[model samples]
Target: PEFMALPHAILVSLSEQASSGYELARRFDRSIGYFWTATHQQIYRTLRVMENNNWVRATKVYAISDSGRAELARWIAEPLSPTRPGRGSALTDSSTRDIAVKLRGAGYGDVAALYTQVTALRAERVKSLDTYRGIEKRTFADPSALDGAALHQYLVLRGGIRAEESAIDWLDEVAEALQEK
Candidate 1:
């Protein structure tokens, strides 16, 4: 439901002024990075949805409309409580750690390899986001198209969207920080 929750947050955040999705994504990167996360594509997608749903409208530069501000105010007035669910064993998965270790271990070819890996990962992530959007569109457009299994798959994909955004944001920070050194 975080995705359902995000447009309101973004609208509230942008109530004071107009901003592009890239700007929203960057701000989300710096602030919401502490909790929720969103990619450029995701943010843009949400903006479009918000616009279509009459919850928000795009300004000259994709700024929030007055209706958007009202919707944001209503949502903000009833804020969702933050949860601290444990990531469990997945946080310490050995295979994931092995990739990090391998990247760090190579002194000579590390940077180039890292670049390739990062680039590929980013591309794949964008593709995944696109796929999720497609699925969401289909589900909403034709709910009857889903069987029990398909509905379950939709829920799973929905959950992964948040985790994927968080992972991508974290990777982006790591990549930028590493480059600056």
Candidate 2:
């Protein structure tokens, strides 16, 4: 009922992993959980609705076939305009989205403190990037060499990295701007 996004996540998990209902729920922890979260009950209930609607099938494995594949195909080619060119959903409310608020908030409070805060944020970004880099190395053969689903998966992680990098860039600029004040 609350999930305008659950079906989107479910179909991607099903199509990509072709996993069982149980496995799909588990896979959510690694994939969709990062962006959109779902409870176990939500997944089970939603899957059945997909089945009833013939949006997905569960013969051996959970899949979006005629019961599924057709819908996925329709979406892929739906020509839904995107703010950016990616199959994945946008990361709304990115920390950077509040950059102006953050720096301005600093003006009301401890302005000098934000410089330290910005440095710390940049530190966290690099540290997290290291962690993501480790995951990429261990999870994929070559981060640079990928195709199809694997590429999509890697690119999603890469997107996270890029977001962090973008933030760090902005953070640096803001730090400099604040310094001038």
Candidate 3:
């Protein structure tokens, strides 16, 4: 299994309010859902595990315990390498950017084929950047008006928007280089 930190995401959400398993799932669908998506089953399973670990407790609703918040803080301060969970994932990383280089090194390169694939990837990235921009305009038009957790969450959205922008830029560069005669 990958280094999924779904538990950390749950902790962040629960830090705001204690919630039922169902409500937690919905909150994720709206908040961190844009970044790390989690299914309801996954949420429920993790919630039970958290309860067992004493990281969270169920008193009619699940809430992050002091231990859970401590864990979340610990994870936040932990250093990350480029190979971490989301780092090389196809959905959100540049693992595809160098495929052509590897293929060329192996003497099986096809610039035309690579060009086609890169252009398709670029299209998807453009759409994603557009979606992020729309969310920014709709939800964060007045960032100064937000504070506390809301401000921090908006900063997370900004991080996503920046990531998509950077990915698109790199994709364009790759596509352009591939097009050279």
Candidate 4:
């Protein structure tokens, strides 16, 4: 059994509940860094590895197995070694050809429809951001006054809020950039 922080971190999460790739990646972002954290690419890569080892099984969503549970317990029981540290837009050419085909195919009405779709997406993201903000306010009335599950959950919400903020920023940029044309 190899010692890997990312796999172990994943096992810990899966032990609690099964999750999709998107859900798992979101949880990684939400978790404290001390355990481990990963990007979408890394999480998916690790999931492939974990699945190959039978550490997890998927029904289009991942769940820890008995094998995984056993290994996780073994890992948990192991002593800490300080030595182990935890570890494309194609607008061009063939890919550009793809966008070119789509773009070339688009009528004025099509572009307008796409823009409308973007607006709806942007609006929904704003609504979600506002909902997260309200959750932060109502649930975390006193920032200094949390511990245990409350604190953990609050941090997760903070991560979600940050992700929402990031998406909103990009969506706003998209609107502005497209509006220019």
| Cα-based lDDT at residue 16, candidate 4 | 71
lDDT of the structure predicted as candidate 3? 0.66
Over the full model, what C-alpha lDDT does candidate 2 score relative to the true structure? 0.61
Worst 10 residues of 3 by lDDT: 100-109
Clashing residue pairs in candidate 4 (N, C-alpha, C atoms within 3 angstroms): none
Question: What is the lDDT of every predicted structure here?
Answer: 0.54, 0.61, 0.66, 0.61
lDDT of 4 at 7: 76
Model 3 compared with the native: what TM-score?
0.48
Predicted candidate 2 versus true structure: per-residue lDDT over 12-108, tens digit per residue: 6766667887888888877656655569999999888888877877666876666455554333332222332332212343333223333432322
User: Rank order by TM-score, top first?
Assistant: 3, 4, 2, 1
Q: Write the per-residue lDDT of candidate 4 for residues 1-181, one digit (tens) a residue.
A: 3555567667766777689888988876765333233578988898899999999998679998888877665554443233433201111112112122223223312444444544554565566778878988999998888989999999988887776676556556756766787
lDDT of 3 at 67: 84
Q: How close is every model to the real structure, measured as TM-score?
A: 0.39, 0.43, 0.48, 0.44
lDDT, residue 175, candidate 4: 62
lDDT of 3 at 56: 90
lDDT of model 3, residue 76? 41
Candidate 1 local lDDT, 63-148, one digit each (tens): 66667655544443332222323222223222222224223333322454454455445455556666667768866566567778
Off-target runs (Cα >4 Å) in candidate 3 are: 1-3, 86-91, 94-181
For all predictions, the C-alpha RMSD in Å is: 17.5, 18.6, 17.9, 19.3
- Candidate 3 lDDT, tens digit per residue, 24-96? 9987787666656569999999898888879898776887888877766554433333464344223555334
